[PDB]
C-alpha cells in the first residue's frame, strides 16, 4: 500500500554494502 | 529637448567650485559659463531659492538677504545636492 | 547540445566504481543478443579498474581510453550495431552509440548529458565532509586522479590532502573531486580534507560542483545539506571567530549558524551573520504559524505603499534630530541620522 | 422535498467568516444563516441555491482576495479545483536546516485546492493514476509518501493547510503550534491544473459511502479555506475608541501619553489578516469581535522610574490597541481577567522597550540605543527596542576615548573587545533591572578576571557581530 520506505532502506543498505564492497579489492592468489 | 541639460549642469558644477569652495581650479571663465549656470539654476526648480537669491542682487548688491531658518536649510541642501560633497562645511561662510 | 533519443543516463553517488551488475546487452532490430562489449573511460588510469572477468554474460571485452574526435557530430553520433556500448563519467560530448540502448553511467552530470534521459539513483543521509587548514596530525596526501588506489585509506584515515597534478584539465580535476566527495559522503564518519590548490582556483571548482549540483537538483535528485562555502564568507567567519571564537571547532560554521539558530525564532529577526554569509534574492525563514522574518512580512510580499512618511522623510525633521545630537555630544562631524523608512508592516 | 435554500447579501460576511478562517463555536452568529452555513460546509448543493454560490463568488472576487483565481463555473464549488495560486522563489542559501519536502525550481507557478486529507499514502494511488494519466514519460520520477514531483517543476505535493513559498523551509526552532487535520494538496505547473480543471473529477469515495456527503472521514473539502486559527473573543468592554491614520507618529505618540499615565504596560496586538485583502467596512465590523491564535502580539513599556506619586496603586485595567484593518485603530479597556485570550507568545515574555527623545537607536539593530548625552553606547540584553522613529548610522567616532590617569578600576564582570583599542564591554544594569551592557572605550581595569566573549546571550553577539566588525565589503 505504501512506497518510499522500502526503496529509502534498500538504498541505504546498499549504499553500506557498497562501502564494505570496496575492501573486495584485496586479491588472494595469482596465475601470471 | 532644446537644453544641453548635462553641460550646463558641468558649467555650474565648475563655476561653483570656483566661487564658493575656491578650489585649487583656476582657468579663464566667459560670459557663457555664467549664463548656462544661470540658465541651469532657473530650470531646475530645487534651485529656485538660488536662483531667486543671485536674482535679488543685480538691483542692491550690498547686503545679505534676510531669510528664515528652513529656508537657510533648503538652500544648504540644495548646494550640497548640486555639489555632491557632503563631506564639507558650506554653512554660511560660502554662501556670502 | 540536443542530445540523441538513443542514450540512456542513470547518475548516482556510488558509481565511483564501475557497477558490473547494471552492464547488459542491448538487441537491434535483428533480435539477436550482442555479446561483443565496447567499454570507454576517461583516462588509461581507470583501465586498470575494469575486470574483465567480471562479465560472465559477455563474449568479449574490449576497453579503449575516450578521446574526444572530431569528425562527427553529436547530433548524429556513428552507429556501430555490431556492439554493445557503456560509457563511464564521460567529460567530453559522445560521440559513439551501440546497438539499441546505450547505458551512461555517471558520477558528474554536466551540459552534454542535461538534454537526455534521466534515471538519478539518489541518496539517503549524505555526511558532511568537513574543510579546515592546519594552522598537529599526520597528514596522509592521496593521489585525486586516481582515488581508487587509496580507498582502504579514505575508509579508514581521517587527515586527508587532495593533490592535483598540473596535468590535469579542468574537468579531469572536477570529475575526481566529485568522486572523493562521493566517497566521504558514503564514509561511516566526517573525513577531515584540504586541498593544495591556489585560492581561485578552488573557487571555481565550487562553483562548477554548486552549479552540477543544480542540475541534479533540476532532475529530481534528493537535496543534501552538505555544501560548499564561499571563501568571502570563509574570511568572515574567521573574522567573528577572532572576535569571539577561541578555538577551531571541527564544523565551526556550522556552530555559528545553529548558535544563532536558537535565537532566530523567539526574536523574530535574522541573524545578521545570516545575512552577510548571502543583489536581491533576500531570505527568509518560517514557522508553523504565519508570518515572515526580515520585517515579520506576510506571505505574499513587501508591501507597495502603507502609509505616509512626512514627518522623517522632511528635510527639517533629519536635520533638527542631527543638530541636537551633535550640540549634546559636542562631535563636528562624522555622524549620520536616517529616517527609520524601513518599515513595511508593525 | 424542500425549497433550495439561500441566502441575502448581508449574510455574506458571515459565510466568509465561517469559511475563510478556522472557527469552532457559533453560538453568536444567527440561526438562520447559519442553516444554509452549515449545509454549505458539509459540500451538500443539491440543497444550496446555485445563484447564491455565484452572487457569493462574485463578492469574493469583489474584495480583491490577494491570490485568488477562478472561473464562472459553479463546478469550481464542487469538484477538486485549484482555487488559490502562488508563486515560489525558493533560494537554499541557507545550508544550515533542510526541506523535508521535495525540491522545488524556481519560477513554478503553484495551485492550492481544496482537497483535504489525513492519511495522504491513500490519496496516493488515485493521485498518482490521474498525473499518469497526464503524462506518458517515466523519468526523473520522484515518490515519497507525501507527494509526486517530476523535473522539479510539475507534479502534486502535500502540506499543511497555510505554508510559506516565500524559499523559507522549516528553519527557526519549529514550534509547536497544535493543529486539526491539516493536509491539503498542492498542485505543480500549469499542465495539471489544465488537466484539473476541464475534467470534474472526485477522489474515489469508499464503496460503502453511498451518502452524498462528499466529506468522509478519509478526506473532506472546504471551500476557498485557509484554516487560519480564529476564536471568539470574551473581552470585558470598559471604554473603546477608534483612530484613523497611517501616519506612525500619531500612534507612537498615543502610546506614549497612555503608557506615561498610569498603567505599567499595555498589549500592542497586530493581527495577521490585515493584508489579505480589502474589506469592506461591515466585513471589519463583524471580525472586532474576533482574534487569531497567530497574529502578532508584543508588550510595550517604558524605562520606568522610582518613587512618584504618577503611581497606580492597583493593576486594575490593562490597554489593548487593535489593528483591525490597514489604517485603523481600536483601542480598548478591559478587566484583567484570567480567562482572557491572546495570541500565543513565542519565547517567555520577550517584552519590548519603548524609546523616548532622548536617545536614539542604531540602525540595523533592535536593541543599539545610543544617548547623546552621556556618550553611552548601549545593548539591551533581552529587552528590545521600538518605537524608533529615527535612526542613527554607526562610526567609530561614537566611541570616545575616555582619557583617564591613573587607569579607571571597573567592579563586575568586564569582556575585552578591541584590546589594541581599548573597547571593553560592561555589564550594566538599571534600577529597573533592565539588563544591559556598556560598550566603552577608553582607560579601564577589572577587579577581577575578564571573562570570555563567547559566554554572552547569542542576542548580543549578533549585535556585537553588526557594531564591530567593518561592513566596507558587499
Known sequence: DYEKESKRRKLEDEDFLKLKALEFSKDIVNEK | ?96 | MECPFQIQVCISDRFFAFPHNLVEPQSDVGNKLIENLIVYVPTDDDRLYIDKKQFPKFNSVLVYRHEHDVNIDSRSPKKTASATIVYWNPLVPITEIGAGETRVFSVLLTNNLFYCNTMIVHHENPKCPIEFTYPKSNLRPIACEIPLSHFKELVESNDFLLCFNLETSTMVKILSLKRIFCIFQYRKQPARYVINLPHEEIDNLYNKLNWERTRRLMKGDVPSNCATVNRSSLKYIKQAQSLLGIPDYSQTVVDFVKMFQKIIFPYQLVPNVIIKLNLFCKNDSIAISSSGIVPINMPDFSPPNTFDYSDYANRTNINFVTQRVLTDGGFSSGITVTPVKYNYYL | GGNLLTLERDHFKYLFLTSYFDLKDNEHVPSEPMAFIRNYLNCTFDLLDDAVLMNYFNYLQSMQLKHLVGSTSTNIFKFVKPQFRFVCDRTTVDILEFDTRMYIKPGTPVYATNLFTSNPRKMMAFLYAEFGKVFKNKIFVNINNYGCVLAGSAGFLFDDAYVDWNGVRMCAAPRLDNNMHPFRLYLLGEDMAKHFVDNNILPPHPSNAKTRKINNSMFMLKNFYKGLPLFKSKYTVVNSTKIVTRKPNDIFNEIDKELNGNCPFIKFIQRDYIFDAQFPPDLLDLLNEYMTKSSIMKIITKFVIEENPAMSGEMSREIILDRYSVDNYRKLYIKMEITNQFPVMYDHESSYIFVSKDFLQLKGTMNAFYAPKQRILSILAVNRLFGATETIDFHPNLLVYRQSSPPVRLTGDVYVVDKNEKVFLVKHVFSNTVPAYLLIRGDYESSSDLKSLRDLNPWVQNTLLKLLIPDSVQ
Open chain 2, 1 to 96: 529637448e532644446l537644453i544641453n541639460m548635462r553641460r550646463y549642469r558641468n558649467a555650474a558644477r565648475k563655476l561653483i567650485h570656483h566661487y564658493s569652495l575656491n578650489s585649487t581650479s583656476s582657468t579663464e571663465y566667459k560670459i557663457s559659463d555664467v549664463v548656462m549656470t544661470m540658465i541651469f539654476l532657473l530650470r531646475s526648480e530645487k534651485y529656485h531659492s538660488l536662483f531667486k537669491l543671485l536674482e535679488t542682487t543685480f538691483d542692491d548688491y550690498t547686503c545679505r538677504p534676510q531669510m528664515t531658518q528652513v529656508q537657510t536649510d533648503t538652500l544648504l541642501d540644495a548646494v550640497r545636492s548640486l555639489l555632491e560633497m557632503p563631506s564639507t562645511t558650506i554653512d554660511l561662510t560660502t554662501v556670502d
